[PDB]
Design a protein around this ligand. Structure first.
Ligand code: 889
Lengths: 258, 302
């Protein structure tokens, strides 16, 4: 129970509306698709496990990417350069000790040069106007967690898992605000582990009712159901580790009782 | 980019360090006076330093009268310039120049009031400063003071973890940090401000430690060795030691003799051991100590 807790939620709710990517940017892109993007993010998830980076770093880099692609035409063979630069910036902003550029060149199979990565860092920064402190699903989950009765590490791990998956698929998740994705991931995880639902305290905090969360919820539930069939698997693998209580192995309900 | 640099006329070098250099300068077209912070990039060719990333990104969210304004960023191929408003002096040098007279108590009060306002704004915007020391507090002739240097600052929508290297200098470091706590909280900034309040009042640093263990024992010797009642958990904390000397709390009116009851109360609450009990910037602003606050102008020996 923090001091500026309320003022912060309100501020993040403001900033998430301003850092919002262009919903339908992918189709105005000449060369890349939602699928290529999904492959890219799944790759970065992998990259974060390799260098033991925070989950917030991953969410931030994805925010940077969607925003850059919101305004810049990118070609297939340069897409991963954008993604690598986003991760580098994300690490510098969020990590205590970021990996060195040499590592970021290495993890690309020398498809790009140290020089290319550094120039792209400049161009990403220019395109984003140095606005790196973006609101993420994680930030809203952290806020929501304080409202656990009691805390359940399983519920927390599972909500993280659901939020992380939502990064992978620009459709349908680009059209939902982080605070909303967070709301759905929290309820779904809560319902699965404990059979409880979106608490009254959070309805007062957020203004979100289970009703308003519904559309994102139905989408998220499907993504949880079809999760093991999905072409991208790095996240599910990450989350069967004991560090996350194996929540990527829990069986989802077959229906949410709405 | 280079059009922009040629519109500046360098006046004089006003600061230098591991970070780079700071020049006072003039806009040749508008006449605006300005501070140019120059960061060399070819020194590690590791790209834009993390310290500029955080300062630039965070500072351009924070618009407040007691936070230094970042005016512009100019990025050439080998240099990075941040353009800031200019202020005449910093608190370290002003305290030093005031050694014989002391800083008048009404000016001390105004300064602390302003610093808390700036810090409240930071915190209510999920920014931790993390390096509040007299040298990063800037002042002008009209009587304002502003938080500066956000190179170690951090957004905390997600909780911020402890780094050994990236820390407040020793004299202003909170006890939780010395004792090895996991996360920073806003409480660590309030601790720093409390140390500075005391130094302004007494003309000496509150806790001038030689090392981490010495810094702790100086705090313990003044404030009392904390116990489980004072601070639930202390004995559990990583770097706590059962072999610690058990000092009694010193009489607080003998630690800051020039202060009245209201001042003593405020500083007690700013130096509370338990981070959760330590007063917040917003709540400190309501303390009766600020009943009568005014805005005096300093004698700047410029
Ligand atoms: C000459 C000093 C007494 C005063 C002085 O340098 N004032 C300033 N006006 N504007 C600025 C500073 C000092 N500035 C700084 O960014 C410096 C703050 C102190 N740290 C240790 C290095 C960076 C900016 C905001 C650019």
């Amino acid at each position: 129970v923090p001091d500026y807790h309320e003022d912060i939620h309100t501020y993040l709710r403001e900033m998430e509306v301003k850092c919002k990517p262009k919903v339908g940017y992918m189709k105005k892109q000449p060369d890349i698709t939602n699928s290529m993007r999904a492959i890219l993010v799944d790759w970065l998830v992998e990259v974060g496990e390799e260098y033991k980076l925070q989950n917030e770093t991953l969410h931030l880099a994805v925010n940077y990417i969607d925003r850059f692609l919101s305004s810049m035409s990118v070609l297939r063979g340069k897409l991963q350069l954008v993604g690598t630069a986003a991760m580098l910036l994300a690490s510098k902003f969020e990590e205590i000790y970021p990996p060195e550029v040499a590592e970021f060149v290495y993890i690309t199979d020398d498809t790009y040069t140290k020089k290319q990565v550094l120039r792209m860092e400049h161009l990403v920064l220019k395109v984003l106007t140095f606005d790196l402190a973006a609101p993420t699903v994680n930030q809203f989950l952290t806020q929501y967690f304080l409202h656990q009765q009691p805390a359940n590490c399983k519920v927390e791990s599972l909500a993280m898992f659901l939020g992380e998956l939502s990064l992978i698929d620009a459709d349908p998740y680009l059209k939902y605000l982080p605070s909303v994705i967070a709301g759905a991931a929290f309820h779904l995880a809560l319902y699965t582990v404990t059979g409880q639902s979106w608490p009254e305290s959070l309805i007062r905090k957020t203004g979100y009712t289970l009703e308003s969360l519904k559309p994102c919820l139905m989408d998220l539930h499907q993504t949880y159901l079809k999760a093991p069939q999905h072409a991208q698997q790095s996240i599910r693998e990450k989350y069967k580790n004991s560090k996350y209580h194996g929540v990527s192995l829990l069986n989802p309900p077959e229906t949410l009782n709405l | 980019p280079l059009v922009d640099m040629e519109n500046f006329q360098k006046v004089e070098k006003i600061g230098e360090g591991t970070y780079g250099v700071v020049y006072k300068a003039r806009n040749k077209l508008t006449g605006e006076v300005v501070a140019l912070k120059k960061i060399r990039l070819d020194t590690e060719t590791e790209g834009v330093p993390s310290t500029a990333i955080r300062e630039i990104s965070l500072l351009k969210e924070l618009n407040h009268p007691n936070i230094v304004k970042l005016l512009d960023v100019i990025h050439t191929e080998n240099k990075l310039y941040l353009v800031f408003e200019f202020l005449h002096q910093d608190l370290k040098k002003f305290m030093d120049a005031s050694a014989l007279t002391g800083i008048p108590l009404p000016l001390i009060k105004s300064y602390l009031f302003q610093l808390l306002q700036g810090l409240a704004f930071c915190h209510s915007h999920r920014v931790l400063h993390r390096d509040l020391k007299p040298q990063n507090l800037l002042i002008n002739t009209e009587g304002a003071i502003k938080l500066a240097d956000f190179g170690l600052a951090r957004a905390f929508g997600v909780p911020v973890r402890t780094y050994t290297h990236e820390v407040v200098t020793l004299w202003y470091r909170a006890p939780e940090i010395l004792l090895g706590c996991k996360y920073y909280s806003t409480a660590v900034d309030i601790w720093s401000l409390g140390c500075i309040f005391a130094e302004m009042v007494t003309r000496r640093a509150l806790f001038p430690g030689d090392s981490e263990i010495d810094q702790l024992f100086r705090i313990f010797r003044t404030l009392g060795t904390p116990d489980e009642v004072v601070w639930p958990g202390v004995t559990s904390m990583p770097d706590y030691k059962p072999s610690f000397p058990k000092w009694a709390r010193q009489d607080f009116s003998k630690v800051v003799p020039p202060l009245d009851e209201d001042g003593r109360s405020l500083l007690s609450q700013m130096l509370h051991y338990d981070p959760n009990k330590r007063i917040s910037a917003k709540a400190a602003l309501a303390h009766p100590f600020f009943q009568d606050v005014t805005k005096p102008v300093p004698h700047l020996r410029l």
